[PDB]
């Protein structure tokens, strides 16, 4: 039970009710002011009655202590969040955080001991690529004094403060909340130089000395402040150490210093000005438009909104507005496009707004109940276009015919002749005489794919208590009456697994029968969302079991059937119209959806099914509930007698976001095409995230002024936008004028904000998220040291500097091991291992520098900086260590130590389920192991009729037996074993078990049930000690290997390593088909300037990649058909390959997969002779040629031994990192040679005919007949 440490990062939405409740229990005076007096008055009346419990008995003492101490500073005051958010970013003290100060100082000294060596190695690596003999000398100083820089920032003191406070709080909570010791003494009000912390079980109290401003916060606020400050520190350091971000540094600094000033005066609404960042960025980017009429278009509305919010908050003056305008001007106006979009990232680095519950429902309640008026003619034209699109969609793939299709009644002879003959038709005839389609009636011709997989239902969600018992989610104290007990669980996966009778065509029939309109239990509820930046913000909805199931089934049907229908001189120009899409789901109506709903009820077979949402909603009341927002009621009444006010939503009509998405998405297009016809221009659409984009095109004469063409595009799109707005207002949806952006150049999407072909990006988005603890159930160093490297590798390719990224990663790893080893809340770290590590130095830094796949604790090898995926994670790290010991960063003993380390104890199955790891003692992932060990039990003990018979008690037995048969031969092959075992039934079980996720709640439930032995609990909680024990023994072991000569190459070294390591199962039999050479070991380069030779190209090397770029001034601007689950059979058969006698076993396992005959399998499989990118700019000016690259080892028609893709990626990487600074491309044109030589990495392969079977094969004696598992009756 003690294996659940508290959370380490913010995940809940801040709510001003929780802190107010805490303090009102504490009886501490405060200054918050709430809209609804419900909570305050309710808790007041309750405490007046006098009820209490252990938690109150606890939280009264803290309040008494605060009351006692307050008398020292008799001129104090509480400063509410975020009105106080200015001081809590500059808060600092030297005394109250002394331990971690010494810790980080020792870490900095450690780093400084080898910074020079790291720089030496990096410079050697760079020079190897021919990028010169020495880097830009303004870099070496930064690389060496990196620690000094990170210490000389302006956020270091607050970072130390909040980190110490957070770790203290976690320690306290994790120690107390476990019922080991029930008796407890209150914490005492600490003292210091300028601050004085009180850390309760749930609240933090800070009291300065000179200012005497008082602060009260909670666990969530502490977490949020820690995250914010850590991100600011990392980002500011990354901008300081680099040079490219010179003026951006000043800009961001001014933005911080300015907006931080409005907080102590404006208040919470400041987050509106904060949320006004992205639109302002887009408008300032628009300011550079080529059609002078568009300049300032969006800017006008942006400034109007800013003036509005100011004049509303109450700054009635005008000079303040003028100065704010000037400040925003200086902030945003720049001259570098690639930096115009960088302010996009910092948009989240100002915190979060404390959002209530009332003012979130007050918005939707008013936007929903409001009348509308539509135009029948326009609606009918839209419906006509829709029917036509469906007609063409079915006419394709069927020889151009309408066989099971509609039947007109009085349509014109013209349109009737199309159906009579068989050709298609366009939007023209439909919009011309829509009167034709007025009265058609389809006939179902599409089947409901129902047994594809089990993903939708298994995606975890929430639920809602039954309609008659809806007051369960509230705790007992926060109401004016005792609530009832909630028996229905709130876990979709548990409720779906513990069932007894389930069949999908029971839910569909439940809807069709109309029972869902009298089901007396269905309910829907709303809950707030976390990490938002608007007081209104958004919400999300949960509902009851049967209705939720019916909804997801319907969505799967529509998205798996008809949904695929809408997937798709003079030249073309195109503008761009961008608009937001939120607050659109609240504007649909039955009157506008019924036509398409009826048409889908026709072409699916189900009667009156695809309009369930409004039909059920119009008689059901909705409300929003959070455990600290209690409805003002006297006693429990049903869901109907509540007055429609202040938390509830009575009788709505508009939909709910997310639900029936595909329906609206496929129903909106006809209006777009209607407007396109009315304007005589073709269009295309896209939805990316939370805003629709439209591209309107137009044809123009070829030879013409480019500016004139781009003016004509805008001229057309203006009229088009006018017409579209008119039509949408006719139908009911009012596309606002301001909130959309017309542009001639750009449009935003997920990866980045595209602009005229070249993509600008926010490199600093990810750096702000590398932290000191990854997110897991038990904080593990092996997890955090990987969560660091992944974000660094991400932030590299978006623009940052490779060398500085590597150095920062090394510093963070050395500074993380120290915290995990000397300052933590774990209880297993005994002095007898804590001391023998911290006392020595070289051992610690060596363990921190050694790569992970060999046994160390570093997770970012050099070859990863350039390429995306490295070849062989063993030989890569061995070559890395070789380069380190060459550059004299590590002693000589380490190589022999790693080559003669002591092996572990692993199974035969994990060797297959992970085919690359030369396995070592205790190098697994605690969370990823606990996931499977807690999944298998629930997945094996559930009687659900969908997964019957798939999980017998002897699962692992057959698993290991099949794995052993597959593996054990006279020559082992892990790759094919992994592939086949994944593509077999065991792989199906594994994929299902992994796809089924887990959480703390499910783990605790399984524990309470007893699916885990105390022995395993001990083995898990005693884990993190073992990696340290093993690293110590590996780094201190004194052995040798006379065969090792460190000039032997990495592959011929890793072979011996693997063999010696796990020889207990190899018995001397070789291991083949696992290793490839490393990229950064056999790839030299050279920079061909205008009038010089090519040394490394003439001394004997002949093969090389050839890159060329000209002096172009730029960087400014310019019997099988439609297969089913059986597809695994063919790929498995090829994986096994052609083996005469073993064809029997191949056919046997394929039959265990599905019902197929040997002849059918043999004819359906193919046969081979073997039984075995738009992230940079300068790329668009190059000319790759692979002329002299044909010289590969043996030059065969086999997979590229070295990866030519990796070669080209490295070439483009160096060619990019050359021109990172200069704007133009220089005077002359540049050529680049990239030679390789891998003669030391050649494998004298001897391809066997095939490993003969060497074991009596054995399977399940009864082929399974479960429907989901591959079809035992396919044809």
């Amino acid at each position: 039970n003690q294996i659940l440490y508290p959370e380490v990062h913010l995940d809940s939405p801040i709510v001003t009710n929780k802190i107010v409740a805490i303090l009102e229990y504490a009886r501490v005076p405060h200054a918050y002011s709430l809209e609804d007096p419900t909570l305050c008055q309710n808790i007041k009346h309750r405490l007046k009655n006098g009820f209490s419990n252990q938690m109150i008995i606890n939280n009264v003492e803290v309040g008494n202590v605060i009351k006692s101490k307050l008398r020292s500073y008799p001129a104090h005051s509480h400063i509410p969040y975020p009105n106080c958010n200015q001081d809590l970013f500059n808060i600092e003290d030297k005394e109250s955080t002394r331990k971690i100060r010494e810790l980080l100082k020792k870490g900095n000294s450690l780093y400084s001991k080898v910074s020079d060596k790291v720089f030496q190695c990096l410079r050697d690596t760079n020079s190897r690529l021919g990028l010169g003999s020495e880097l830009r000398e303004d870099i070496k100083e930064k690389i060496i004094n990196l620690g000094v820089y990170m210490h000389s920032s302006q956020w270091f003191e607050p970072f130390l403060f909040w980190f110490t406070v957070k770790t203290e709080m976690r320690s306290v909570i994790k120690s107390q909340t476990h019922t080991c010791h029930r008796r407890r003494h209150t914490p005492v009000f600490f003292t210091g130089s300028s601050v004085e912390l009180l850390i309760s079980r749930d609240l933090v109290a800070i009291i300065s000395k000179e200012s005497q401003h008082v602060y009260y916060l909670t666990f969530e606020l502490v977490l949020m402040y820690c995250d914010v400050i850590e991100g600011r520190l990392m980002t500011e350091t990354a901008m300081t150490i680099d040079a490219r971000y010179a003026e951006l540094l000043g800009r961001v600094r001014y933005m911080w210093k300015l907006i931080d000033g409005f907080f102590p005066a404006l208040g919470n609404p400041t987050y509106q000005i904060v949320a006004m960042l992205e639109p302002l960025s887009l408008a300032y980017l628009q300011l550079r438009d080529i059609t002078v009429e568009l300049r300032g278009a969006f800017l006008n509305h942006c400034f109007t909104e800013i003036h509005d919010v100011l004049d509303q908050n109450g700054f009635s003056d005008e000079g303040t507005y003028h100065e704010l305008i000037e400040a925003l001007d200086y902030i945003f106006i720049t001259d570098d496009i690639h930096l115009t979009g960088e302010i996009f990232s910092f948009f989240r680095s100002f915190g979060h707004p404390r959002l209530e519950a009332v003012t979130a429902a007050e918005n939707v309640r008013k936007y929903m109940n409001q009348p509308k008026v539509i135009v029948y003619e326009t609606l009918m034209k839209g419906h006509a276009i829709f029917c036509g699109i469906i007609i063409n969609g079915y006419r394709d793939r069927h020889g151009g015919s309408w066989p099971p299709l509609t039947l007109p009644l009085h349509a014109a002879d013209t349109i009737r002749n199309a159906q009579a003959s068989g050709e298609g038709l366009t939007h023209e005839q439909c919009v011309d005489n829509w009167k034709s389609f007025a009265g058609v009636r389809f006939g179902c011709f599409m089947p409901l794919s129902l047994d594809s997989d089990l993903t939708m239902y298994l995606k975890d969600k929430a639920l809602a208590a039954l309609q008659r018992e809806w007051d369960s989610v509230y705790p007992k104290e926060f109401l004016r009456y005792d609530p009832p007990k909630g028996t229905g669980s709130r876990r979709l996966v548990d409720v779906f697994l513990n069932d007894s009778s389930f069949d999908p065509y029971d839910m569909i029939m439940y809807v069709v029968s109309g029972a869902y309109l009298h089901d007396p239990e269905f309910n829907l509820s709303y809950s707030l969302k976390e990490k938002e930046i608007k007081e209104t913000g958004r919400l999300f909805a949960k509902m009851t079991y049967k209705m939720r199931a019916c909804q997801v089934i319907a969505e799967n049907l529509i998205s798996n059937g008809i949904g695929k229908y809408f997937k798709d001189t003079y030249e073309t120009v195109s503008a761009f119209i961008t608009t937001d899409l939120k607050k659109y789901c609240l504007n649909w109506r039955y009157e506008t959806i019924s036509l398409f709903a009826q048409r889908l009820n026709e072409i699916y077979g189900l009667p009156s099914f695809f309009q369930w949402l409004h039909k059920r909603l119009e008689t059901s009341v909705l409300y929003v509930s959070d455990p600290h927002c209690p409805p003002d009621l006297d006693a429990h009444v049903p869901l109907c007698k509540v007055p429609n006010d202040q938390i509830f939503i009575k009788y709505p009509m508009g939909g709910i976001e997310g639900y029936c998405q595909k329906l609206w998405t496929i129903s909106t297009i006809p209006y777009l095409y209607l407007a396109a016809y009315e304007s005589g221009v073709r269009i295309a659409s896209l939805v990316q995230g939370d805003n629709q984009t439209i591209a309107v095109t137009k044809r123009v004469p070829s030879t013409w002024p480019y500016n004139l063409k781009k003016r004509e595009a805008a001229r057309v799109t203006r009229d088009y936008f006018v017409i579209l707005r008119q039509r949408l207002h006719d139908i009911g949806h009012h596309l606002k004028a301001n909130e959309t952006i017309v542009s001639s150049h750009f449009f935003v999407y997920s990866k980045g904000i595209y602009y005229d072909g070249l993509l600008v990006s926010q490199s600093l988005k990810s750096i702000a998220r590398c932290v000191f603890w990854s997110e897991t159930i038990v904080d593990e160093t092996r997890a955090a040291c990987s969560n660091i490297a992944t974000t660094m590798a991400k932030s590299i390719e978006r623009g940052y500097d490779r060398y500085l990224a590597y150095s920062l990663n090394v510093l963070k790893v050395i500074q993380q091991i120290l915290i995990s080893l000397g300052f933590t809340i774990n209880s297993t770290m005994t002095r007898d291992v804590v001391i023998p590590l911290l006392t020595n130095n070289d051992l610690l830094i060596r363990m921190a520098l050694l790569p992970a796949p060999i046994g160390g604790m570093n997770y970012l090898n050099m070859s990863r900086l350039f390429v995306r995926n490295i070849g062989d994670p063993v030989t890569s790290s061995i070559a890395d260590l070789k380069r380190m010991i060459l550059a004299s960063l590590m002693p000589e003993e380490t190589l022999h130590q790693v080559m003669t380390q002591q092996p572990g104890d692993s199974s035969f199955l994990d060797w297959a389920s992970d085919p690359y790891s030369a396995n070592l003692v205790c190098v697994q992932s605690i969370t990823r192991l606990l996931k499977n060990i807690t999944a298998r039990f629930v997945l094996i003990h559930s009687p659900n009729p969908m997964l019957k018979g798939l999980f017998h008690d002897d699962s692992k037995e057959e698993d290991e037996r099949l794995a052993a048969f597959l593996m054990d031969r006279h020559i082992i092959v892990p790759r094919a074993a992994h592939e086949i075992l994944d593509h077999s039934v065991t792989g199906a079980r594994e994929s299902i078990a992994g796809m089924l996720d887990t959480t703390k709640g499910l783990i605790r439930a399984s524990m309470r049930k007893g699916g885990l032995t105390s022995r395993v609990i001990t083995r898990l909680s005693n884990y993190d000690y073992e990696q340290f024990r093993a690293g110590m023994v590996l780094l201190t072991g004194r052995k040798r290997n006379v065969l090792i000569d460190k000039e032997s190459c990495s592959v011929q070294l890793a072979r011996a390593l693997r063999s010696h390591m796990w020889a207990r199962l190899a018995r001397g039999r070789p291991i083949y088909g696992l290793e490839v050479p490393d990229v950064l070991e056999s790839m030299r380069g050279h920079l061909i300037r205008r009038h010089e030779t090519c040394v490394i190209c003439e001394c004997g090397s002949v093969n090389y990649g050839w890159f060329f770029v000209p002096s172009g001034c730029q960087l400014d601007d310019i019997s099988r058909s439609l297969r089913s689950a059986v597809r695994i059979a063919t790929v498995y058969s090829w994986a096994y390959g052609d083996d005469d006698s073993s064809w029997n076993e191949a056919w046997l396992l394929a039959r265990q997969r599905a019902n197929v005959s040997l002849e059918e399998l043999r004819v359906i499989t193919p046969i081979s002779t073997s039984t075995n990118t738009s992230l940079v700019r300068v790329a668009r000016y190059t000319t790759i040629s692979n002329d002299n690259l044909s010289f590969v080892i043996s030059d065969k028609k086999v997979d590229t031994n070295f990866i030519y893709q990796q070669g080209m990626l490295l070439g483009l990487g160096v060619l990019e990192t050359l021109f990172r600074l200069e704007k133009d491309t220089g005077s002359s044109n540049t050529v680049l040679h990239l030679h390789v030589e891998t003669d030391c990495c050649v494998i004298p392969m001897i391809d066997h005919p095939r490993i003969p079977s060497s074991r009596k094969l054995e399977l399940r004696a009864e082929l399974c007949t479960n429907p989901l598992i591959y079809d035992n009756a396919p044809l």
Binding site: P371, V373, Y376, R589, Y590, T619, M653
Partner: peptide
């Protein structure tokens, strides 16, 4: 027949131009 035809045509043109009004209550 002519007057009947034109009367039917005017009635069809009348019914081809119609608005739809939606309330804001579920069951009044």
């Amino acid at each position: 027949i002519n007057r009947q035809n034109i009367s039917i045509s005017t009635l069809e043109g009348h019914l081809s131009s119609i608005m739809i009004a939606i309330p804001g209550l579920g069951k009044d």
